[PDB]
Each structure stands twice: as C-alpha cells, then as structure tokens.
C-alpha cells in the first residue's frame, strides 16, 4: 500500500502505468487530424 498520506491517490495510481500507451494512441489522433500526411 502507498503511505497513508498519499492514500488519497490510490485510484489515480491504478491508472498511471497505462499512460504511455495513450501517447501511441495520441499519435494516431494527431495523424487523423492532419489527414495522414
């Protein structure tokens, strides 16, 4: 468990590891926006 004073953040921490995956997906939203140029 996290130290008690950061306990407030458990549910955010459960999500942080996945964020680098989102950068890959963001690369495709960006390319969709400029028309796969």
């Amino acid at each position: 468990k996290l130290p008690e004073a950061y306990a407030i953040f458990d549910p955010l921490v459960d999500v942080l590891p996945v964020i680098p995956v989102l950068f890959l997906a963001l690369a495709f939203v960006w390319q969709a926006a400029v028309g796969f140029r």
Partner: peptide, 27 residues
C-alpha cells in the same frame, strides 16, 4: 471510480489536438 481519472487523463490528449486544429496551429 478509477474510471473518473482515466477519463480526465484520457481526454487530455484529444483536447490538445482539438484546441490546436481550431486555433489553426502548427499541427
């Protein structure tokens, strides 16, 4: 739940693209 944060975080990325293609930026 956890789905609240992953929603705020998940929208950050498309939000950036939207603001820039509306303010016609260097996309």
């Amino acid at each position: 739940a956890q789905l609240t944060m992953i929603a705020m975080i998940g929208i950050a990325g498309p939000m950036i693209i939207f603001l820039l293609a509306v303010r016609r930026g260097n996309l």
